[PDB]
Amino acid sequence: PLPWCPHLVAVCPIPAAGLDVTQPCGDCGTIQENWVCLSCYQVYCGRYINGHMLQHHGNSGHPLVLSYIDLSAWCYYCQAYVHHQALLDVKNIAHQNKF
């Protein structure tokens, strides 16, 4: 995994509403393998379900998403996982809600 990427600048402030790691996909309603977008905080399913987060990346350009299965952060441009200080606050809020 990368220690930085050029798309970290698109990570936006965490909503005052917080995160819900059990939130369903906004398109198909599945609860199975969802991601949250770190730009606008919408929730959509992974590529092995119905591919709605990949569709969201295509229609918005938003780069970075966080997994509600394992708290990994993926960049669709770099095609890599990313670790950086800028991601710690959102990962810690998700960890508290999940566990």
Ligand X SMILES: CC(=O)Nc1nc(C)cs1
**Residues forming the annotated binding site?**
5, 7, 25, 28, 37, 40, 45, 52, 56, 62, 75, 78
Q: Which residues are CB-neighbours of 34 under 8 A, at least 6 positions away?
A: 23, 24, 25, 43, 44, 45, 46, 53, 68
Q: How many CA atoms are closer than 13 Å to the CA of 71, on its beta-carbon side? A: 16
List 3, 13, 15, 70, residue binding ligand X (CB under 6 A): 70
List 8, 23, 33, 41, residue binding ligand X (CB under 6 A): 33
Taking the mean position of all CA atoms in its chain, how far away is CA 84? 14
List 40, 88, 96, 97, residue binding Zn ion (CB under 5 A): 40
Could you say whether residue 75 binds Zn ion (CB under 5 A)?
yes
Could you say whether residue 72 binds ligand X (CB under 6 A)?
yes
Nearer to ligand X, 10 or 33 (CB): 33
Per the CB < 8 A criterion, the answer to whether 29 and 2 are in contact is no
- The option from Zn ion, ligand X, none interacting with 39 (CB < 5 to 8 A, set by class) reads Zn ion
